[PDB]
Amino acid sequence: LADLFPGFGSEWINTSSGRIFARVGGDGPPLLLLHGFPQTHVMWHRVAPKLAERFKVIVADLPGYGWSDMPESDEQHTPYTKRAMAKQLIEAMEQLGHVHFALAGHDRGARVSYRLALDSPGRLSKLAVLDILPTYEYWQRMNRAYALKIYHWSFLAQPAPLPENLLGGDPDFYVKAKLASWTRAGDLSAFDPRAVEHYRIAFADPMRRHVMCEDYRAGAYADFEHDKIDVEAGNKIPVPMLALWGASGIAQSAATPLDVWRKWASDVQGAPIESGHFLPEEAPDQTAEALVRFFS
Amino acid sequence: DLADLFPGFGSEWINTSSGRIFARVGGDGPPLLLLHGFPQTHVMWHRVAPKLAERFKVIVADLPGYGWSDMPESDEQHTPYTKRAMAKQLIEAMEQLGHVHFALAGHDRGARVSYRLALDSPGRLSKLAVLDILPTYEYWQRMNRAYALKIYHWSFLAQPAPLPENLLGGDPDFYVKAKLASWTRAGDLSAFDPRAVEHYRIAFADPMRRHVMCEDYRAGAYADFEHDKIDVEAGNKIPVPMLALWGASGIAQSAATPLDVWRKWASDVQGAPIESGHFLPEEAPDQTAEALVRFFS
């Protein structure tokens, strides 16, 4: 597997829920970058060097993903709920002396990020979320058109071992299909082949695949419930937030993203990027510039 | 080896312009066509067809593309596997037997053929029974988080090929057994005859058969939904006397009852819950058979 972060260090961070793997480079204010599905920390490899000129950049594998440890799940999918993931990454950052930090997340990692900002807003200086709406909003918009577009939200949340057994026959096909289907071009041309290999190797482990399903199970159940409480209680993210989304991404397929986030966040600014779902790889310079400007 | 679960029924290959329909045929009297759904074949009627065959000429058909029926070549609109096209093909098949006016009971996908047949060609039916469904339009119109999780396969199997085909290939025996078990009241395979399960497992083992099923669900997401919408909008109702049966823990039921739904779609509908999961003729064969004989007699 290639090293896609030349000059970045590597850290194995112990937490109460297992080790978090991260690449660390740069200097300045701490900035935690979180990937999503079906990727690993290396999806940031085109944006992180730009960010490292101005920030101390911590590029972490989510709990259970990549090279982070995989806590054993349970019937409520607890360690893979975004609430638990957020708490574990807070501990990880505390291990490095970062009790107040900026955070950008993509996809699942963006869900960890906004839940972190709802649960523990005093930990964040600023927050950026890339190509998502809150989990609640997706489920509340789950009509025929959206159920067909993000079918995997309900497929991967089926009880174990149904998705796991199906994914196990040809894992390579499914991870490449998901990467391709969500890009603007609809193929793998936007990705560094070395990055794809990272994603494919991670997906080839059945325990990693199970964790991803647990993530999606949490996404259908506990994550939705946590979000529901906040939206119905009128709880808003108080941290200044940036919402970036791909013109051809997932978030815009169910609503106008800024309008949605303004219901969730008191101080949110937003921009589309001509891109599919994978903004830091499909539009690295555009994304990096938006992030550098926002966090500066 | 596959068990004969209809002792005393003949086996017919019925030619149509779209391919052969396989059927078991037994009994004498007025014709009654029985249609199965997914992931099954005609053998799902094996516990109720003998009781029906006491009073009717019972034709137990594999749906086009399913079981031993031929598989017409699909197209980008999944036309042969739209319920409109399946209904037309089954009408042709019954015509080959001289049945232009018949009774019809369908379960699952076969019930969707059945009510589309009733909307498109109600003059062909004396009476109609649908088992544990609501119209396709109603499922998609109800689509929310709860329904999306419960009938996830409606959107999973409708994904563009080869995605569901490739995934189903990952463990087909598990998938078909998982669908059978998860939709019963018991939650396991104990309601089924093991010889019937073998029929279902073998049919599901064929990748071409699995592709057909995906074509059926693709139709269900697209053309079938559009055909239903036209009837909702036009206010077209089924005018054939109709029975809607559903499982206490089947599919069609939420806290709103399938009968209230079907009365929007049908002018003359009676209905009854059966203590059963989705697979009424196998989980609850005596109760299902009684309801059907009473209605059709």
Side-chain angles (χ1 to χ4, degrees), chain B residues 10-279:
Chain B
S11 295
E12 296 238 26
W13 299 90
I14 314 175
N15 311 98
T16 77
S17 52
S18 302
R20 295 171 299 165
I21 294 301
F22 178 76
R24 302 299 300 277
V25 178
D28 66 90
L32 156 73
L33 171 63
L34 299 177
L35 304 180
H36 66 90
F38 167 95
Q40 299 189 294
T41 67
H42 72 279
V43 305
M44 57 149 288
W45 298 100
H46 75 105
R47 306 188 149 119
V48 308
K51 188 151 308 296
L52 296 172
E54 290 169 4
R55 306 191 172 197
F56 302 95
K57 182 180 175 195
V58 175
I59 304 124
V60 201
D62 289 332
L63 292 180
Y66 279 78
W68 299 332
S69 289
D70 285 344
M71 301 173 278
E73 181 221 283
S74 206
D75 58 35
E76 294 76 40
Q77 304 198 18
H78 325 298
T79 310
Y81 300 103
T82 64
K83 304 312 158 286
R84 169 156 292 154
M86 293 187 172
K88 284 177 187 162
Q89 182 173 1
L90 287 164
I91 286 167
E92 262 199 38
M94 296 290 270
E95 286 209 344
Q96 299 295 308
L97 305 177
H99 306 313
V100 295
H101 189 69
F102 47 92
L104 175 58
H107 178 253
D108 190 85
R109 312 312 288 184
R112 310 190 176 280
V113 179
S114 299
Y115 79 81
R116 167 52 49 203
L117 196 163
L119 286 167
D120 286 356
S121 290
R124 299 275 172 167
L125 302 179
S126 52
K127 279 172 166 172
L128 159 73
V130 290
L131 285 64
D132 211 46
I133 62 145
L134 308 181
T136 289
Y137 171 96
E138 298 297 337
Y139 280 29
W140 288 117
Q141 275 305 117
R142 267 148 193 76
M143 200 30 79
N144 62 14
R145 167 177 168 269
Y147 274 114
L149 295 174
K150 296 268 218 55
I151 49 167
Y152 83 96
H153 61 296
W154 279 48
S155 51
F156 166 60
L157 298 174
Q159 293 305 297
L163 182 120
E165 286 89 349
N166 282 352
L167 281 201
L168 293 181
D171 196 341
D173 277 10
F174 165 84
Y175 193 72
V176 63
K177 293 193 287 191
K179 283 303 168 263
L180 295 171
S182 72
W183 296 343
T184 59
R185 203 181 50 142
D188 62 10
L189 290 184
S190 63
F192 308 93
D193 197 306
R195 299 169 295 162
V197 176
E198 184 57 23
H199 275 263
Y200 313 143
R201 204 191 50 80
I202 294 206
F204 204 81
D206 189 332
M208 282 324 308
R209 296 283 168 192
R210 290 200 301 271
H211 173 64
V212 165
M213 303 174 196
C214 296
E215 288 297 288
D216 174 356
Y217 277 87
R218 283 164 190 141
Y222 293 104
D224 290 341
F225 170 76
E226 305 289 353
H227 297 164
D228 279 14
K229 187 177 173 281
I230 288 144
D231 290 310
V232 180
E233 293 186 320
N236 301 336
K237 290 211 180 184
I238 294 155
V240 180
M242 169 189 317
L243 178 73
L245 302 178
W246 64 93
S249 357
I251 301 263
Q253 53 85 39
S254 290
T257 177
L259 184 48
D260 290 331
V261 173
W262 276 110
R263 298 221 214 261
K264 325 268 213 284
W265 284 81
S267 61
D268 178 0
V269 64
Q270 56 205 279
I274 301 273
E275 181 168 335
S276 158
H278 181 54
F279 299 98

Side-chain angles (χ1 to χ4, degrees), chain A residues 57-73:
Chain A
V57 172
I58 297 125
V59 201
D61 282 338
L62 291 177
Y65 282 77
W67 297 338
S68 292
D69 287 337
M70 293 174 286
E72 181 179 1
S73 198

Side-chain angles (χ1 to χ4, degrees), chain A residues 121-136:
Chain A
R123 294 283 175 159
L124 297 183
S125 56
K126 284 177 169 189
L127 158 77
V129 296
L130 281 69
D131 211 47
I132 67 153
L133 310 175
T135 291
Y136 174 90

Side-chain angles (χ1 to χ4, degrees), chain A residues 2-284:
Chain A
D3 169 19
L4 296 156
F5 302 79
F8 278 55
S10 293
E11 282 268 48
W12 285 102
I13 309 171
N14 298 279
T15 78
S16 66
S17 287
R19 299 172 304 156
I20 292 290
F21 178 78
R23 305 295 303 269
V24 177
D27 56 81
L31 169 57
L32 174 63
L33 297 183
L34 300 176
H35 67 92
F37 166 97
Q39 301 193 293
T40 68
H41 73 279
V42 314
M43 63 153 277
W44 298 102
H45 72 104
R46 296 180 163 137
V47 161
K50 295 240 192 302
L51 288 174
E53 314 300 303
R54 309 205 162 179
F55 302 89
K56 173 61 84 168
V57 172
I58 297 125
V59 201
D61 282 338
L62 291 177
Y65 282 77
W67 297 338
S68 292
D69 287 337
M70 293 174 286
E72 181 179 1
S73 198
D74 53 44
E75 319 68 50
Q76 284 235 36
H77 323 295
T78 301
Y80 298 102
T81 63
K82 308 309 160 287
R83 169 160 293 156
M85 287 190 171
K87 281 185 200 147
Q88 177 176 0
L89 288 167
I90 284 165
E91 306 177 37
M93 290 296 274
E94 228 174 54
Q95 291 295 309
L96 310 165
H98 306 314
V99 294
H100 190 69
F101 50 93
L103 175 62
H106 178 251
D107 190 270
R108 309 315 283 180
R111 311 192 173 278
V112 176
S113 299
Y114 80 81
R115 168 52 53 195
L116 201 156
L118 275 164
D119 284 354
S120 291
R123 294 283 175 159
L124 297 183
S125 56
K126 284 177 169 189
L127 158 77
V129 296
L130 281 69
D131 211 47
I132 67 153
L133 310 175
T135 291
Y136 174 90
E137 297 292 346
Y138 281 24
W139 285 117
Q140 285 294 128
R141 296 180 156 73
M142 192 68 59
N143 57 22
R144 156 182 176 271
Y146 211 37
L148 292 169
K149 310 336 176 242
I150 56 159
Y151 81 94
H152 63 292
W153 272 50
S154 68
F155 169 61
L156 296 173
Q158 290 304 299
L162 184 130
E164 289 90 346
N165 284 354
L166 296 195
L167 293 174
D170 191 351
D172 274 7
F173 161 78
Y174 191 75
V175 61
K176 291 185 283 202
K178 288 291 155 287
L179 296 165
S181 63
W182 300 343
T183 62
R184 168 145 129 154
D187 55 26
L188 302 167
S189 58
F191 307 99
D192 194 295
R194 296 170 299 164
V196 184
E197 192 54 21
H198 273 269
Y199 311 143
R200 196 198 61 83
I201 286 321
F203 203 80
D205 183 332
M207 279 317 303
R208 298 288 173 183
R209 290 192 306 266
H210 175 60
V211 160
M212 291 173 286
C213 292
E214 286 301 297
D215 182 347
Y216 275 86
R217 292 175 182 122
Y221 292 107
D223 289 339
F224 171 80
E225 303 296 341
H226 300 161
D227 275 12
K228 175 173 183 296
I229 280 145
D230 287 314
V231 75
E232 294 183 330
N235 297 333
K236 288 201 179 197
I237 287 152
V239 180
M241 175 201 324
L242 174 74
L244 299 183
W245 66 89
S248 309
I250 303 180
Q252 56 91 44
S253 289
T256 321
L258 216 31
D259 280 336
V260 177
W261 276 110
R262 294 197 315 254
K263 192 162 67 57
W264 286 80
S266 69
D267 177 11
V268 51
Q269 90 190 244
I273 299 263
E274 208 30 76
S275 163
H277 184 56
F278 301 100
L279 276 61
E281 297 168 288
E282 299 184 63

